[PDB]
Design an enzyme around this catalytic site. Structure first.
Site, PDB file in Angstrom:
ATOM      1  N   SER A 150     -25.198 -10.547  28.771  1.00 45.38           N
ATOM      2  CA  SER A 150     -24.842  -9.173  29.210  1.00 45.38           C
ATOM      3  C   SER A 150     -23.127  -8.973  28.827  1.00 45.38           C
ATOM      4  O   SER A 150     -22.798  -9.377  27.835  1.00 45.38           O
ATOM      5  CB  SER A 150     -25.137  -9.248  30.488  1.00 45.38           C
ATOM      6  OG  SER A 150     -24.694  -7.843  31.195  1.00 45.38           O
ATOM      7  N   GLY A 196     -45.040  -6.121  32.786  1.00 46.20           N
ATOM      8  CA  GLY A 196     -44.227  -7.386  33.214  1.00 46.20           C
ATOM      9  C   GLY A 196     -42.356  -7.164  33.246  1.00 46.20           C
ATOM     10  O   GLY A 196     -41.916  -8.128  33.657  1.00 46.20           O
ATOM     11  N   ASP A 256     -33.958  -3.173  27.032  1.00 48.16           N
ATOM     12  CA  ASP A 256     -34.260  -4.355  27.526  1.00 48.16           C
ATOM     13  C   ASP A 256     -34.392  -4.340  29.142  1.00 48.16           C
ATOM     14  O   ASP A 256     -34.162  -5.097  29.981  1.00 48.16           O
ATOM     15  CB  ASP A 256     -33.565  -5.596  27.443  1.00 48.16           C
ATOM     16  CG  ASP A 256     -32.064  -5.672  27.807  1.00 48.16           C
ATOM     17  OD1 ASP A 256     -31.618  -4.483  28.622  1.00 48.16           O
ATOM     18  OD2 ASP A 256     -31.433  -6.689  27.859  1.00 48.16           O
ATOM     19  N   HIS A 279     -33.678  -7.873  30.531  1.00 49.06           N
ATOM     20  CA  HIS A 279     -32.352  -8.115  30.587  1.00 49.06           C
ATOM     21  C   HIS A 279     -32.573  -9.631  31.597  1.00 49.06           C
ATOM     22  O   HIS A 279     -31.542 -10.327  31.450  1.00 49.06           O
ATOM     23  CB  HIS A 279     -31.576  -7.144  31.140  1.00 49.06           C
ATOM     24  CG  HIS A 279     -30.301  -7.325  31.102  1.00 49.06           C
ATOM     25  ND1 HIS A 279     -29.406  -6.945  29.836  1.00 49.06           N
ATOM     26  CD2 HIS A 279     -29.323  -7.584  31.813  1.00 49.06           C
ATOM     27  CE1 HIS A 279     -28.198  -7.049  29.904  1.00 49.06           C
ATOM     28  NE2 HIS A 279     -28.197  -7.508  31.382  1.00 49.06           N
ATOM     29  N   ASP A 326     -35.851 -13.179  36.491  1.00 49.92           N
ATOM     30  CA  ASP A 326     -37.067 -12.422  36.778  1.00 49.92           C
ATOM     31  C   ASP A 326     -38.196 -13.474  35.843  1.00 49.92           C
ATOM     32  O   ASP A 326     -37.871 -14.049  34.823  1.00 49.92           O
ATOM     33  CB  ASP A 326     -37.239 -11.373  36.194  1.00 49.92           C
ATOM     34  CG  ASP A 326     -38.470 -10.421  36.756  1.00 49.92           C
ATOM     35  OD1 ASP A 326     -38.573 -10.224  37.691  1.00 49.92           O
ATOM     36  OD2 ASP A 326     -39.210  -9.873  35.929  1.00 49.92           O
ATOM     37  N   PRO A 327     -39.410 -13.747  36.338  1.00 49.35           N
ATOM     38  CA  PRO A 327     -40.380 -14.528  35.742  1.00 49.35           C
ATOM     39  C   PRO A 327     -40.978 -13.781  34.582  1.00 49.35           C
ATOM     40  O   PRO A 327     -40.651 -12.431  34.301  1.00 49.35           O
ATOM     41  CB  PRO A 327     -41.638 -14.910  36.625  1.00 49.35           C
ATOM     42  CG  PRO A 327     -41.534 -13.638  37.625  1.00 49.35           C
ATOM     43  CD  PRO A 327     -40.000 -13.079  37.793  1.00 49.35           C
TER      44      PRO A 327
END
Ligand SMILES: [Ca+2]
Ligand SMILES: [Cl-]
Ligand code: NA
Ligand SMILES: [Zn+2]
Length: 387
Positions: free
Chosen positions: A112, A285, A316, A357, A364-365
């Site tokens: 990022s 997701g 993203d 991202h 995040d999974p």
């Protein structure tokens, strides 16, 4: 790996991020998936983690990164500090790799806005700051060696989901409120509440230069309300400004690729186009915060004044994908598709990955994303680079 250089890897977060002892040990680099630094070390790739001010300007973060690497007291530069009204000196670090002062080198892997910071640190090491050199003469003050120029210790910069041309998310209405909602969401991913006045720091925003610190008996909710109205959100000397399309272009006008450094970029996308007008929409997701709050805007915002058209709609969840392969707006850097050989002094565009991202760092999974294999394969490539 067939090892061609012995340089350690250094991880560098974006506009969220915290040290390994912070967030009760929930790792920014790995998140709910594990500990990326530990994976790299356990596989024989020596790796360290930097923690700098998440909301602070790339300039400040570069000065913090420098002191944290070689050791000493963060020095933001007398001219810069006077111009924006914050302290010249930050905190003091023991130094992760003092051998950088005697010929060691490093690979930086940045996520990022970390990618802007890593680019800027290289630029400052190579060229210094004319302004700071002049100011030190004029006002008879000391000068950080960072601003002298003629230094070099970054062998490669790898950026992942970096907004090199900014993100149009900054232009969203109520971006201020939604950005700090993003901070709370990341805290919640770390199982940290935003309405609890923790006595330990938990998430240190490292705002020593601005004199800002979460107070005893203050929740993150209450703290962020203050931060919203503070100079680290309302000045130009901020991550928020550097994150904008306009601010990123300004950064690109002076932060250029060094011929002595390999640059690798990884892009991320997590959207589809609909059949109505060609807007982009979050895939199933994508992390819940981005899917609801950010992705619909990112995949539909157009702005002719700023050149924001259909190429900007893929994203993203946080950053427009087109922004990620390298600096372009206001930049003379060259970007070349990866072709099996990594080149110095140019951006090697390692392609786009169907990962959002926060998934790309494991916050995040995403079970279809082999995050361990991603970072191990990257470390192998860096290990192979010609010094
Ligand atoms: Ca996900
Ligand atoms: Cl304060
Ligand atoms: Na970010
Ligand atoms: Zn500053």
């Amino acid at each position: 790996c067939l090892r061609a250089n012995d340089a350690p890897i250094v991880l560098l977060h974006g506009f969220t991020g915290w040290g390994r002892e912070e967030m009760f040990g929930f790792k920014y680099w790995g998140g709910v998936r594990g500990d990326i630094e530990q994976w790299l070390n356990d596989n024989g790739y020596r790796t360290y983690t930097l923690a700098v001010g998440p909301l602070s300007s790339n300039w400040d973060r570069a000065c913090e990164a420098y002191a944290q690497l070689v050791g000493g007291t963060v020095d933001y530069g007398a001219a810069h500090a006077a111009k924006h009204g914050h302290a010249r000196f930050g905190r003091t670090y023991p130094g992760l790799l003092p051998e950088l002062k005697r010929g060691g080198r490093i690979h930086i892997i940045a996520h990022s806005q970390g990618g802007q910071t890593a680019r800027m640190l290289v630029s400052l090491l190579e060229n210094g700051s004319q302004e700071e050199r002049e100011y030190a003469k004029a006002h008879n003050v000391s000068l950080s060696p960072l601003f002298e120029g003629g230094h070099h210790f970054v062998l490669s910069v790898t950026t992942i989901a970096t907004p090199h041309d900014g993100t149009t998310l900054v232009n969203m209405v109520d971006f201020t409120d939604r950005f700090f909602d993003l901070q709370k969401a990341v805290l919640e991913a770390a199982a940290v509440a935003s309405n609890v006045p923790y006595t330990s720091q938990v998430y240190d925003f490292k705002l020593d230069q601005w004199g800002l610190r979460r107070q005893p008996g203050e929740s993150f909710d209450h703290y962020f309300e203050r931060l919203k109205r503070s100079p680290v959100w309302t000045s130009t000397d901020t991550a928020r400004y550097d994150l904008s399309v306009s601010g990123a272009e300004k950064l690109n006008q002076w932060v250029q690729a060094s011929p002595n450094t390999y640059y690798l970029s990884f892009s991320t996308e997590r959207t589809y186009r609909g059949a109505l007008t060609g807007n982009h929409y979050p895939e199933l997701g994508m992390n819940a915060f981005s899917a609801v709050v950010c992705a619909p805007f990112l995949g539909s915002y157009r702005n002719p004044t700023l050149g924001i058209d259909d190429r900007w709609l893929e994203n993203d969840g946080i950053v427009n994908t087109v922004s990620m392969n390298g600096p372009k707006r206001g930049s003379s850097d060259r970007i070349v598709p990866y072709d099996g050989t990594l080149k110095k002094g140019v951006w090697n565009d390692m392609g786009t990955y169907n990962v959002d991202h926060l998934e790309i760092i494991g916050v995040d999974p995403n079970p279809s994303f082999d995050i361990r294999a991603f970072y191990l394969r990257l470390a192998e490539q860096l290990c192979s680079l010609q010094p």
